[PDB]
Each structure stands twice: as C-alpha cells, then as structure tokens.
Amino acid sequence: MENFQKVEKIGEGTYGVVYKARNKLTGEVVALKKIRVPSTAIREISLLKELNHPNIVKLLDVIHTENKLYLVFEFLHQDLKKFMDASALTGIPLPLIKSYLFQLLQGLAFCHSHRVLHRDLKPQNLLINTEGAIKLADFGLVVTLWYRAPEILLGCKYYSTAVDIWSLGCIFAEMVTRRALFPGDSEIDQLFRIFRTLGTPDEVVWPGVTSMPDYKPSFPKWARQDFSKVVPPLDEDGRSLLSQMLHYDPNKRISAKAALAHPFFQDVTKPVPHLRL
Ligand SMILES: CN1CCN(c2cccc3nc(-c4n[nH]c5cc(-c6ccc(N)cc6)ccc45)[nH]c23)CC1
Numbered sequence: 001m002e003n004f005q006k007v008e009k010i011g012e013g014t015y016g017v018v019y020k021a022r023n024k025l026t027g028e029v030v031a032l033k034k035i036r037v038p039s040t041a042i043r044e045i046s047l048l049k050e051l052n053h054p055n056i057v058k059l060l061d062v063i064h065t066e067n068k069l070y071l072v073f074e075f076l077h078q079d080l081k082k083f084m085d086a087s088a089l090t091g092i093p094l095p096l097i098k099s100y101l102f103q104l105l106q107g108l109a110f111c112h113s114h115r116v117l118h119r120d121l122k123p124q125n126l127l128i129n130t131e132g133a134i135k136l137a138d139f140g141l142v143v144t145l146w147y148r149a150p151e152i153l154l155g156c157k158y159y160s161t162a163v164d165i166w167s168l169g170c171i172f173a174e175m176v177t178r179r180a181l182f183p184g185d186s187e188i189d190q191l192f193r194i195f196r197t198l199g200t201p202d203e204v205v206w207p208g209v210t211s212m213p214d215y216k217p218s219f220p221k222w223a224r225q226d227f228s229k230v231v232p233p234l235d236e237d238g239r240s241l242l243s244q245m246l247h248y249d250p251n252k253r254i255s256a257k258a259a260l261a262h263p264f265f266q267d268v269t270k271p272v273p274h275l276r277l
Contacts, residue, residue, distance in 0.1 A: 001063060001070055004032055014143070020075060030060060035069035041141070045071070048139065051116060055107030057127055057137040076135065077277050080171075081123035086276065088178050096271045097175045100134045102260065104168055107136045109256035112161040121167035122147045123174070132272045145190040146183050147171065150201065151250050153191045155213030162250035165259070169245030176234050192220070198246065199224030206248040237264040
C-alpha cells in the first residue's frame with residue numbers, strides 16, 4: 001500500500017472509501033477501494049479477479065495487509081449519474097442510450113453466465129469513458145432503493161440474476177425520461193411506487209407472490225398504469241423491451257442474453273459521448 005499515492009477521494013460507501021490514486025511503481029492511475037476479515041471473502045474476491053470483460057470495470061489487484069483490504073480497480077473518468085445530470089436539459093440522444101443499454105446487457109449476460117449477480121446496479125456505479133464505453137462497477141457481495149427489484153423488497157432471500165435486469169430497466173427508463181422511475185425513500189414507499197405504476201402484483205401475474213415473506217394481504221390494490229404514460233418519448237420497440245425487463249415475476253422477466261436479441265437493438269451503434277472531464 002506504500003506503493004500508492006492517493007490523489008483524491010472519489011467515493012464513500014458503507015463498505016469502504018474509494019480514492020483516485022497513483023501506483024508509485026506501475027505509474028498507473030487507478031481507483032483504490034479501502035475496505036474497513038473472512039477468508040471466504042478472500043476467495044470470493046479472488047474469483048472476481050478472473051471475471052474479466054470489456055463492460056466490467058477491471059479488478060487489477062487485491063491487497064490484503066493487516067486489518068485492511070484494498071482493491072485496486074481500473075480508473076474511469078465519469079459515472080453515468082454525472083453524465084445524466086450534465087445531459088438533463090437536452091437529454092442523452094437515443095442512439096447513445098441504446099448503446100449503453102446494449103453494452104450493459106453484454107456485461108450482465110457475461111456475469112450471469114458465471115452465476116455472478118451485481119445486486120446493486122445504479123447510475124452511480126456505472127462508469128463511462130471517452131470512447132463510448134460503459135462499464136459495471138461496485139459489485140455488491142443512506143442506501144438508495146430506487147433500483148431494487150420487487151422480489152428483494154418482499155423479502156425473497158434467494159433471488160436471481162433477474163434482479164439486475166430489473167435495476168437496468170429502471171436505469172433505462174431514467175435515461176429516456178430524465179427522471180427516476182421509482183424514487184422511493186423507504187422500502188414500503190419504494191414498493192408502493194412500483195405498485196402504483198405497474199399495478200399491485202397478485203397470483204395472476206406473479207404466481208407465489210402472496211406467500212413471499214413480506215407480502216401483506218393488506219397491501220393496497222392499485223391498477224396498472226398505461227405504459228405509454230410511463231416513458232412517453234420512447235418508441236414501441238423500447239417500451240416493449242422495458243416492459244419485459246420490468247416483469248414482476250422474476251421467471252418471466254427477460255434474461256440479459258434474450259434482451260440482446262430484442263428488435264430494439266437491430267440498429268444499435270456505438271456513438272461517442274461528449275464528456276466534460
Ligand atoms: C458516487 N460516484 C462514484 C463515481 N465517482 C467517480 C467520479 C469520477 C471518476 C470516477 N472514477 C471512478 C472509478 N473508476 N474505477 C472505479 C472502480 C470502482 C469499483 C468499486 C468497487 C468494485 N467492486 C468495482 C469497482 C468504483 C469507482 C471507480 N469513480 C468516479 C463519483 C461519485
């Protein structure tokens with residue numbers, strides 16, 4: 001760790017803190033996460049090092065010394081959140097939204113084929129570069145609930161890769177409308193905001209829902225809203241794909257692999273964004 005000079009504090013979480021740092025040796029500029037421990041986690045992390053893909057932020061090295069764990073990541077220059085904020089008055093052009101969505105589905109298809117889940121996708125841990133790339137970061141092993149799948153909120157303990165598809169659907173929506181799709185400030189408000197838009201789930205659309213740990217018969221019954229009202233600007237191919245990413249039933253929810261074959265992506269390209277760094 002003496003091999004690193006911290007340049008500036010990049011992020012703070014409930015696990016650790018992230019710094020932009022320079023390797024006094026390699027010369028490289030990297031993102032250094034200071035985790036503040038389980039041997040099983042040492043092996044869990046050791047496995048993430050092999051999980052290498054163009055759309056996953058590279059774990060360059062793992063450094064375990066004393067009562068600290070440091071993870072050295074590939075550095076990227078901006079997060080999607082900042083880019084969304086910066087594009088808020090014009091909106092991200094559709095071709096770029098499509099490219100980012102496609103690339104993220106590629107990243108997820110990869111992860112998921114290795115039975116790895118992200119669990120906590122959000123704009124803040126999606127990182128972009130000048131080349132038009134977007135990458136998955138901050139894999140999960142005040143907390144924002146806005147992107148949480150309904151099965152998680154209802155207490156499902158052994159949830160699936162489908163949770164990441166739900167999160168990405170919410171992010172897709174957000175890029176298109178320039179507003180959070182489900183901005184809840186508590187678990188129940190998150191759940192109820194979902195219900196109010198997509199309708200209160202029942203056994204018809206989601207077999208087994210009523211026997212989930214935190215499901216309550218006393219949940220209010222709201223009707224599903226018209227989808228054309230939810231992401232207006234978006235064309236029918238986009239809305240179609242979104243609806244399949246936001247299916248209640250995790251087993252009906254589209255896979256990353258299947259989503260990549262959706263008609264929406266027939267004309268996909270790779271624009272370059274204009275980044276102000
Ligand atoms: C809230 N945001 C976060 C992003 N922040 C940020 C701003 C500007 C440039 C940034 N570059 C990063 C970054 N590069 N590489 C990373 C790797 C992880 C990582 C961490 C954990 C894992 N597991 C994998 C990768 C997290 C963050 C980064 N983050 C940046 C701005 C504030």
